[PDB]
Amino acid sequence: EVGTVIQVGDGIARVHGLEKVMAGELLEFENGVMGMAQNLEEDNVGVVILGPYTEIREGTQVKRTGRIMEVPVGEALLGRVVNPLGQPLDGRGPIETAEYRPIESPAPGVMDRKSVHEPLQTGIKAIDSMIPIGRGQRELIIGDRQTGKTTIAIDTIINQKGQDVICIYVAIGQKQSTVAGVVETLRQHDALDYTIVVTASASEPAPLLYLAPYAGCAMGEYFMYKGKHALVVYDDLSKQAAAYRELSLLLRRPPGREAYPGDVFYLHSRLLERAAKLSDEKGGGSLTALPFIETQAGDVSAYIPTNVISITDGQIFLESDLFYSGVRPAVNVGISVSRVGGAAQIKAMKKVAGTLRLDLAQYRELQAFAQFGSDLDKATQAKLNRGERTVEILKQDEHKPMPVEEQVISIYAVTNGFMDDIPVEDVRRFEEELLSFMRANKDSLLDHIRQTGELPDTKELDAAIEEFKKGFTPSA
Amino acid sequence: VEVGTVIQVGDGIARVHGLEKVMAGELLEFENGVMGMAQNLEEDNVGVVILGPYTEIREGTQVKRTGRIMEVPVGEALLGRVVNPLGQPLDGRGPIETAEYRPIESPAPGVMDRKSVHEPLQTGIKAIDSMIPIGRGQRELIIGDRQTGKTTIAIDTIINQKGQDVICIYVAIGQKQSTVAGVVETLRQHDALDYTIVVTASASEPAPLLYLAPYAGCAMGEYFMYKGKHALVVYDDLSKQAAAYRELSLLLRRPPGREAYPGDVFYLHSRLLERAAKLSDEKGGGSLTALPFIETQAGDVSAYIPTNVISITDGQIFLESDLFYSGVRPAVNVGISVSRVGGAAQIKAMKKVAGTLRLDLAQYRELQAFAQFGSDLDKATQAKLNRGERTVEILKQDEHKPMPVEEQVISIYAVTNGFMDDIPVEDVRRFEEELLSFMRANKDSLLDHIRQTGELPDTKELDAAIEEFKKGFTP
Amino acid sequence: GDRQTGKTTIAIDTIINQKGQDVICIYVAIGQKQSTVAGVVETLRQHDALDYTIVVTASASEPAPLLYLAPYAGCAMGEYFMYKGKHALVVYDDLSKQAAAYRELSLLLRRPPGREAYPGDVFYLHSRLLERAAKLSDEKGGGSLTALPFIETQAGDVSAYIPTNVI
Amino acid sequence: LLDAKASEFGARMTAMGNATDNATEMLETLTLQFNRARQAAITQEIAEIVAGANALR
Amino acid sequence: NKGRIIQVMGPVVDIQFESGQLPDIYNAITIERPQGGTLTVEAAVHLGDNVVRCVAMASTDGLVRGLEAVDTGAPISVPVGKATLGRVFNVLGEPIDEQGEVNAEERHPIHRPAPEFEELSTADEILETGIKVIDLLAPYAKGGKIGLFGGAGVGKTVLIQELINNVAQEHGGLSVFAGVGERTREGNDLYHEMKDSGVISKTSMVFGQMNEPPGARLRVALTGLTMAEYFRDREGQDVLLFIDNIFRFTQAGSEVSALLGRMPSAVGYQPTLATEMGQLQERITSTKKGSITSIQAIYVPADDYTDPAPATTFAHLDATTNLERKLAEMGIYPAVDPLASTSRILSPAVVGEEHYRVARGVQQVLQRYNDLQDIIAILGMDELSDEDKLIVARARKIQRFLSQPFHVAEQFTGMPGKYVPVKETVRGFKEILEGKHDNLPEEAFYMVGTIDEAVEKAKKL
Amino acid sequence: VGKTVLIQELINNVAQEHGGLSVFAGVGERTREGNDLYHEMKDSGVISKTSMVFGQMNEPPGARLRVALTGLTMAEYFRDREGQDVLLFIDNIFRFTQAGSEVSALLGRMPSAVGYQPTLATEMGQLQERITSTKKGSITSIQAIYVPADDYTD
Ligand SMILES: Nc1ncnc2c1ncn2[C@@H]1O[C@H](COP(=O)(O)OP(=O)(O)O)[C@@H](O)[C@H]1O
Ligand SMILES: Nc1ncnc2c1ncn2[C@@H]1O[C@H](COP(=O)(O)OP(=O)(O)O)[C@@H](O)[C@H]1O
Ligand SMILES: Nc1ncnc2c1ncn2[C@@H]1O[C@H](COP(=O)(O)OP(=O)(O)O)[C@@H](O)[C@H]1O
Ligand SMILES: Nc1ncnc2c1ncn2[C@@H]1O[C@H](COP(=O)(O)OP(=O)(O)O)[C@@H](O)[C@H]1O
Ligand SMILES: Nc1ncnc2c1ncn2[C@@H]1O[C@H](COP(=O)(O)OP(=O)(O)O)[C@@H](O)[C@H]1O
Ligand SMILES: [Mg+2]
Ligand SMILES: [Mg+2]
Ligand SMILES: [Mg+2]
Ligand SMILES: [Mg+2]
């Protein structure tokens, strides 16, 4: 069944004929370029072109496919770079797969799920201790440009090496050179073999930027519904929302706030609800999501950022002021949160970290108010001294992930006072020296945690740290 | 009748073919007894805003003209009753027995039909009656954020009209109906309901009723004004009325402007509030006094609707959250609030004593920066701060406890002439309560002088009587 | 500069000082009060500066399109002298009112508004005008058109949209 | 000590004098920003309302 | 009564019927999908030329022009009464718990006029929540309407669950939970949470969550409220109605609005924002026949309480709990603005003379501290008067003693939760104001229940 | 503070010594205050030297937009055909501009900056440029001016 193009402009076409076409149906133009039926009007069809549109004109013919908007899926995509249509961009030939999956798909309903209970370890102390992510969780990464958002997700993917977790990095609206840089960084850390890379680069037409996250979602859903575990990164949804605005405005749909369409919330909410933790009956598989938002001047109260904050199960807010003051990763402890919390942590970490976030939020408030005069009473002085030390522990270099067992020991040390007699400038070296000591000499304690997920005997642990302490020389 | 047929219906609006000879603003009846109003007379339809349930109105349903502009029942039968903007009883005490009606839209008294406002409307609230005096025929805006004490000012004002021969009308636009039931019950308990009419377009009613509610209340009060009696109307609030008229205007596709309001949203309120007036002696001497309400958002008095109503009325009473939560209740910003009528709406006694209160507080507000420097300051400024904190305490006032003007004059006289300077700041409010119960029981000849003459009594007698009381007061 | 900071008096004094320097002057008055323009011509007459000066005027009561065109008219009047190898001076007093007039026009034609409700091409409005003022090469006759455009700021805000455009 | 006290209160007069002047200076540049923002809110909000209405008219 | 699909535009479907067999507004209409299954759809506008614009209650992907559509002849109708108890429904009244049919005697339409003025009283009797900030400063009234306002991630859902924990477990009557446009994950947790505590059998549940199209989110609240109306009106009962989140009803309204052809109002909302809300909200009330205590979570877009959605919602409430991000960022949970939160019953007449005096005392101290925050940040704390430095000390202790660990938040706080009765809340804050704890360190008051636990926590520091 | 007293004294002192007349245009006049101003001028006697025009708060936008022109047209006669120095008082000239924005909204015109009519400047120029000194005489205008939100850059 055929239709003819009446008018085309900016990658949007109005098509005569195609009387029997479905809403959301995949269409093929004369020259092999795909399209999507978006509007079924009284005697024409609104069609968004999903590819190069220079060779499409008035008179070009369009064929229905009788299939809903779909993408290739499966193990053939691992280690490959594809666009939102599933076509290989890396120039290593075709994607040998028999299995497909629809781009729009219903989310797991209320009865199909289980409460999130299994860690997804980022390897970043700040996150795994204070803002713990779990399998099936949606956790927003939000912050200005150059606050360290992409490096959080890249480090998280790298840390899934050998954890039997399939990763999907969706790149919406980035420059393509940057995306090539990302794949190369993954290759060098031997993380590309279990990672799919979806990319709608900044030069692509808006509808591909719009679809890119839904394609990546379907690619990860495949693994979830077979009882395996996946991780999807949308970098970023700010550029996707802008692209959907461009599209909505080109189709002359009435604009609202900041010229976005009324359904821009729905755009993100349907996407992120499809990430979940399934019940035991449905296979126990999971899809974990890390959507990104790029703020302007740290404004987390803007329209699109608040939308995505209200959708996800928490957020990790990064700030420039923190970054440049040497707090890296630059996590605003007060505004960040994990709504899943302790449930997404091993019992050891839940014990040592329990109140860590609330303790630091109080530290940061009390620190701001202490530089405004007063010679402080000894109680608040000690709280500030404990606070500066725990802050130093939560600093962490880029691409240097820590095992959870080593994080629990490090956080245990500082929170039980074992660094109170050490200079603040020495805390980070104390930690590095402590853990190399624990690995070489006290591995039976570390191993307890890896196996049981519980703390070892606190008396044995206290002794082992105090043993280390006697061989530590401060700097001042 | 000629009849018309409905082309389109949705969101409480119908577009109707036919009805060629219909007037703009005419009442229409749909086939099933539901009324409507002709709003837009278009080239090939009539825009009709439906004044009731619209689920049973469809394409094809027939509409009859009535040939009548909107009217509402009026008169003494409404006193103590709760009605909607059409005058239908909502309190379930049966019909409203009245032969007189009056049109909802009606022209305002012209320039020559009026007399300068000269008669007090005593709110019973010290802060208002002393600093922002309202007069009979005045329009005084009550404006402030949510929960700043606006409704309680109007309720207390109505209560204080007990036995003053002033008919009160509380118009409730867009409120929750439970709240309105609460208001009528508060009036009942203070024995203020039998001289008060209550008009209510609750939040669930169609927008056109919220739009009409204030005009209905206005007509109900106008009736008493044009018979030479005196009325008081409260519109609580015009913010919700304007939003309702916007809903209507936008559904009729009238071009939006600032905050999506139509061009004539100013005209909406200006027509309404100009109908409140003080008539000349030739026209009967009656009055309608108006207290419109505006609800600001985050104290933004420069927003579109607030600025409209500020520029219409004869002054305003601004209420603030900061004042309220600091214990200044009623939370009247005395500096920024204004009565354009002023001393003309005050008895001579109050105009005299309030003269000094204003200058005392103006000096207090300037010197307030220096209040954390207690006893470093020279003795002149120390005394100004001490006088200031005491007058502030006098202007605090309990809810639902209006004061007679004669008692206000004595209380303000006491504090402004220094009779509380010896007393702790924490004792001032009890000192006042104890003083007035003393004046009522023992020195009523002094209070009565003020009720009869409107003048202060002889200052030497008054000073003595207060100093007499003082000797029996324990801090 | 702000209103009443001495902008017009700079241009009037500059025109007067071209007496005997063989420089043709053009004072374009966009959106001023007409009394002021009458005052300007009279001041020029008294300093014997009027006989080498052209005065273009779209007063505040004139329809917006005349305010829009006024600077381009004055530009052409000065260009004539530039392209014959002579030297001219044009004053646009002021481009703030011209831009407001072009906004009025653009909004009446329902062209989409942007910053401060100005159209997208409000920069282009001033840039084409002011680029036509130049110093020509020796081959093209060596003539010149010198331009003194005016901007009226509000409360000294030089970072506003129209001022930054013209800067 | 009394010369030293006079010197304290002179120094404080002129330090808080400057802080008062610097505050008024900052109030100008803060007022300028507040009103740019106030004006832009109204301007931008309306364009949005009118853009929505012109997609139907 | 048959019709043909003429247009499909997102969640909006235009359907042409035959002359004078047009469905009433708000009627349910079924369309058999080409893919199999039924799409239900709700009539909204009569466009003329025998066309009806309709709002879809599920996805319109896969529909084709010219399909048959059938008028059901009445609005969406939903099971009511005891068969709803223990069950989980969608917007249409179909069970989604996979427990077979619902054998309910009656099925009511979800659209309905509000109760008459004559039917309404006021709610004047305190409901103890066990949460210090609420009980003291903005107490809830039994049979009242209670709003939980907050921006994204400040603790609305945590608070609504803690209220379910603290009040519903020992409640004598029935309950309804309406999950309007929020996280499916949190519905799943709340189901299992209620199943384990056994409260499920006293509660009907309805879910139309944030993954569903606008139609579903627009109407799901009515489905829940129709079940609650039965228990009030026809079993004279005390009902608890929880709605999380009522903003999503208003938001779905604004999503459909542009495609229904309405000219948009301020901030892009529908022009019928206020009336659409009133028609829903006025039905949520206590009548003479029975009482509904309703607790509604209310989202605040962009943290802006002046946004038309939350601004209009305030008119419908007898108490409010205003969550602010500033407090959440300090670690004060629940993040309740102790000045912006309000209650109709915070008066000496209801809570007694001491309670009122203490609460106003607390608010006076906090307000004063707020005023000095600016002065302190520049001129520093040494330059305050002795009266002010003492007020700041107490204000900070007060601010911390208003925080409280929640039973439901044992995962996030890491501490066990606390229920604090009103008598103890009043006593604690009275003593702080009186000066009895001026020498305990600030951290002592943070995240504890009674004043006695603060004295005990001081010893550990 | 003495606005009306000052406006009457100017009417008096222009009338006594230069022999010129006055016009008062109440643009959004409040009806109560029109009545007071009439009687106030009658008592001081300045009334006989003054024409008064009121486009009052309850009139539609068109009336409030154009009432100032009515007053100005009366003053133009006294300037041009009796060679007088005339006073035109306008209270309030902001309400002229505001009525302009109201009528622009109803004509469907796209708004300009801060929601004002796109013809803000020209509408003002068409009023203001008529208030001027000619060779025959003069009109001096004395205008009360509201400043929205205390913002002189509005
Ligand atoms: N934890 C860290 N320590 C040191 N440098 C970091 C850290 N995290 C990020 N960076 C650096 O900050 C810069 C910005 O990181 P990027 O991930 O590109 O942030 P974004 O994606 O938000 O722009 C990069 O140069 C990166 O190497
Ligand atoms: N009483 C509390 N104790 C500890 N944490 C809390 C409390 N209330 C809120 N929070 C924190 O804030 C987060 C947001 O709460 P939630 O109700 O899920 O957000 P929303 O306001 O978006 O409905 C929680 O995950 C939790 O970590
Ligand atoms: N003068 C007062 N003193 C003490 N409490 C008051 C006073 N005025 C009002 N209140 C209380 O404050 C709240 C404000 O309510 P209301 O008068 O309705 O203000 P608004 O109409 O601005 O919301 C109510 O709970 C009321 O009981
Ligand atoms: N150098 C100067 N010396 C004295 N007065 C001046 C000087 N420059 C300007 N003025 C006066 O200042 C007023 C405003 O100057 P003008 O050049 O008209 O400013 P603008 O054109 O920016 O409004 C004029 O009336 C003029 O008399
Ligand atoms: N020049 C003056 N001499 C004496 N009293 C004056 C003078 N001007 C004003 N007043 C006094 O102030 C009062 C208010 O002035 P008014 O002209 O009504 O101001 P406005 O027009 O601002 O209302 C007058 O009624 C009069 O008592
Ligand atoms: Mg990045
Ligand atoms: Mg109120
Ligand atoms: Mg000039
Ligand atoms: Mg929530």
Tab-separated table of N, CA, C and O and ligand atoms in Angstrom, chain C residues 2-10, ligand 4:
chain	number	residue	atom	x	y	z
C	2	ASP	N	21.805	57.823	29.624
C	2	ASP	CA	20.417	58.052	30.049
C	2	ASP	C	19.843	59.295	29.391
C	2	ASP	O	20.567	60.073	28.777
C	3	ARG	N	18.544	59.488	29.541
C	3	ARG	CA	17.901	60.735	29.155
C	3	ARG	C	18.538	61.912	29.918
C	3	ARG	O	18.923	61.746	31.084
C	4	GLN	N	18.651	63.078	29.278
C	4	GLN	CA	19.166	64.308	29.911
C	4	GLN	C	20.616	64.206	30.434
C	4	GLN	O	20.969	64.855	31.428
C	5	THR	N	21.450	63.411	29.770
C	5	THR	CA	22.872	63.328	30.099
C	5	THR	C	23.800	64.138	29.154
C	5	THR	O	25.032	64.186	29.348
C	6	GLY	N	23.209	64.760	28.135
C	6	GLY	CA	23.923	65.690	27.250
C	6	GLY	C	24.320	65.133	25.892
C	6	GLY	O	25.324	65.570	25.319
C	7	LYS	N	23.522	64.188	25.368
C	7	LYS	CA	23.819	63.478	24.119
C	7	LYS	C	23.581	64.377	22.883
C	7	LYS	O	24.446	64.502	22.018
C	8	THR	N	22.395	64.958	22.781
C	8	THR	CA	22.052	65.822	21.653
C	8	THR	C	22.984	67.031	21.558
C	8	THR	O	23.448	67.364	20.473
C	9	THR	N	23.288	67.675	22.709
C	9	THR	CA	24.230	68.801	22.713
C	9	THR	C	25.628	68.436	22.186
C	9	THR	O	26.286	69.308	21.629
C	10	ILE	N	26.070	67.174	22.346
C	10	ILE	CA	27.348	66.756	21.767
C	10	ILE	C	27.288	66.817	20.234
C	10	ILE	O	28.194	67.342	19.593
G	4	LIG	N1	28.081	71.071	28.328
G	4	LIG	C1	26.932	71.538	28.851
G	4	LIG	N2	26.892	72.643	29.641
G	4	LIG	C2	25.731	73.106	30.164
G	4	LIG	N3	24.530	72.517	29.939
G	4	LIG	C3	24.436	71.401	29.157
G	4	LIG	C4	25.665	70.841	28.565
G	4	LIG	N4	25.303	69.768	27.858
G	4	LIG	C5	23.952	69.641	27.973
G	4	LIG	N5	23.440	70.614	28.746
G	4	LIG	C6	22.026	70.806	29.114
G	4	LIG	O1	21.485	69.562	29.537
G	4	LIG	C7	20.194	69.375	28.951
G	4	LIG	C8	20.111	67.968	28.388
G	4	LIG	O2	21.096	67.874	27.361
G	4	LIG	P1	20.815	67.121	25.980
G	4	LIG	O3	22.056	67.299	25.124
G	4	LIG	O4	19.489	67.566	25.414
G	4	LIG	O5	20.727	65.625	26.626
G	4	LIG	P2	19.920	64.390	25.945
G	4	LIG	O6	19.956	64.725	24.479
G	4	LIG	O7	20.749	63.146	26.279
G	4	LIG	O8	18.516	64.494	26.522
G	4	LIG	C9	19.993	70.428	27.853
G	4	LIG	O9	18.760	71.150	28.040
G	4	LIG	C10	21.212	71.319	27.926
G	4	LIG	O10	20.800	72.678	28.134
